[PDB]
């Protein structure tokens, strides 16, 4: 029943995107894992629920988003499908490839269970379903470790363009005008993502409704259903229509594929949806701070964010850059990209940004130093003569460094023995242990430890030169 299932069973089979038919075949033929990556609205429910209807057993789906799981279950119930929501024939395939990825801003999971169920039914369809990007794609090929159904020219329904806030006198007014010359869903950075931006837009006469973590679930469902029937044209969301006149980002997204996913929820039919990106250097540094303190509390995150930064600052087509990022061939796309519509305008804008890049003083200098230095960034073997050698009270003080300082102290003690006739080496071992431990407890940073041991060895040399024995 690769195609004999038809729309009559659930709702679907019409070869939505002709390889959509093969999307069933890619599962029907059992071609291991097929990298299904298509623009939103592609009927992936046909791709990975038809085998769920046709599996000899179960086809457990990894759709973390419980609300998403329940919505899928009920929408398929409207299509008469034996699917059950286990969230909180089908029990609710490695679905939601962004769930196992931090780039799709969905790497917020827990154990296996559903994943464990999938590993149990590996004989049953093992599918992976908009993350086919060498960084992200190989992350799926490594972290998840599975044909690429990535769209050949991604999507030409978005008029990608980048406008810099520094160049614009009134970024709020500029985004209001851009929305005017175009429903709409807008994302941005944290620190009350919705509230302030939505208030400013509403003051601009463009009713923007907030969707934040602190908002009530009743508010969430009200704004969602209002946005469904065009009651509220503009909805602001943090990370949470076939028209979607604007998906502009006031601030940069958390991850490159995160930005792709947040801008990829437009044009269900394929109608143009503009889509614009606003970039700020201060925003770049702030998010660099955030990601660095996140990874501190891993290098792929900073590498991909730098890739995003250079993508927003490169002289070339945005679709070409995403092909470099998503691994596709040359897009060869017509007008609809900022460099495609006007290379000169993009080059002039980047040049203008480069030219315009340049108690309050305390915090200003602190932020400057942090932003300008951030971008610039073993147990004792057998017989180490150190007291509590397995300690790290002094940062970046390697045990080999401790051994070297101890050897400097030990040759100092040997010279003191040759000059003052100390007892022997057997108790000199314990004496060196005590001296090094005292120097350890009297210093905090590594340089301070080196300075203190240098001062102590200078004092030992002074005592040896004086001729008196090195007393306590």
């Amino acid at each position: 029943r690769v195609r004999s299932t038809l729309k009559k069973v659930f709702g679907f089979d019409s070869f939505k995107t002709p390889l959509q038919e093969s999307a069933t075949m890619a599962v029907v033929k059992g071609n291991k894992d097929v990298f299904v990556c298509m623009p939103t609205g592609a009927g992936k429910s046909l791709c990975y629920q038809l085998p769920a209807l046709l599996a000899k057993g179960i086809t457990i789906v990894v759709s973390p988003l419980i609300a998403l799981i329940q919505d899928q279950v009920d929408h398929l119930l409207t299509l008469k499908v034996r699917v059950s929501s286990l969230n909180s024939k089908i029990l609710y395939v490695v679905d939601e490839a962004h769930c196992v990825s931090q780039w799709g801003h969905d790497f917020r999971p827990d154990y296996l269970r559903l994943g464990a169920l999938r590993s149990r039914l590996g004989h049953a369809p093992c599918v992976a379903l908009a993350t086919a990007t060498p960084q992200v794609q190989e992350d799926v090929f490594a972290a998840l470790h599975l044909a690429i159904f990535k769209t050949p020219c991604f999507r030409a329904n978005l008029f990608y363009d980048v406008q810099f806030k520094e160049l614009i006198s009134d970024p709020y007014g500029n985004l209001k005008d851009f929305c005017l010359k175009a429903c709409g869903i807008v994302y941005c950075r944290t620190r009350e993502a919705c509230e302030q931006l939505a208030i400013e837009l509403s003051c601009r006469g463009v009713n923007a409704k907030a969707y934040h973590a602190g908002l009530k679930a009743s508010e969430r469902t009200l704004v969602q259903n209002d946005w469904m029937e065009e009651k509220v044209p503009v909805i602001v969301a943090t990370i949470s229509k076939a028209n979607v006149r604007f998906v502009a980002h006031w601030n940069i997204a958390k991850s490159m594929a995160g930005y792709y996913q947040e801008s990829g929820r437009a044009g269900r039919d394929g109608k143009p949806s503009w889509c614009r990106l606003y970039y700020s250097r201060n925003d770049r540094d702030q998010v660099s701070f955030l990601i660095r303190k996140e990874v501190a509390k891993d290098k792929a995150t900073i590498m991909a964010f730098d890739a995003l930064v250079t993508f927003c600052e490169e002289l070339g087509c945005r679709h070409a850059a995403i092909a470099k990022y998503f691994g596709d061939a040359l897009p060869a796309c017509a007008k609809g990209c900022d460099h495609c519509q006007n290379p000169t305008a993009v080059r002039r804008r980047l040049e203008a940004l480069e030219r315009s890049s340049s108690e309050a003083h305390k915090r200003e200098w602190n932020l400057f130093y942090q932003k300008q230095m951030q971008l610039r960034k073993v147990p004792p073997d057998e017989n180490c003569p150190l007291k509590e050698a397995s300690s790290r009270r002094i940062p970046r003080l390697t045990v080999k460094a401790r051994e070297h300082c101890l050897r400097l102290l030990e040759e100092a003690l040997s010279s003191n023995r040759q000059s003052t006739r100390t007892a022997d080496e057997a108790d000199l071992r314990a004496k060196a242990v005590e001296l090094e431990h005292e120097t350890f407890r009297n210093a905090k940073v590594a340089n301070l430890y080196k300075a203190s041991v240098l001062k102590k060895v200078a004092d030992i040399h002074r005592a040896s030169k004086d001729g008196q024995p090195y007393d306590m």
Partner: protein, 66 residues
Amino acid sequence: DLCKGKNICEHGGCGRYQPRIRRSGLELYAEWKHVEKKILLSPERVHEIFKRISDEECFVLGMEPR
């Protein structure tokens, strides 16, 4: 001080917005941001605005009606 930060008329009806009043010498201006843009607030207009304020709404402003 409490009422300056509200640019939107919530409470009661009149869901419309409130302009920014800027004084240039002897002239007032209602610089409507985007909801034309600048209108020289005529004193007859402010007279019409003020004549509608209820007694409660002016006594709370400190101005006794009588």
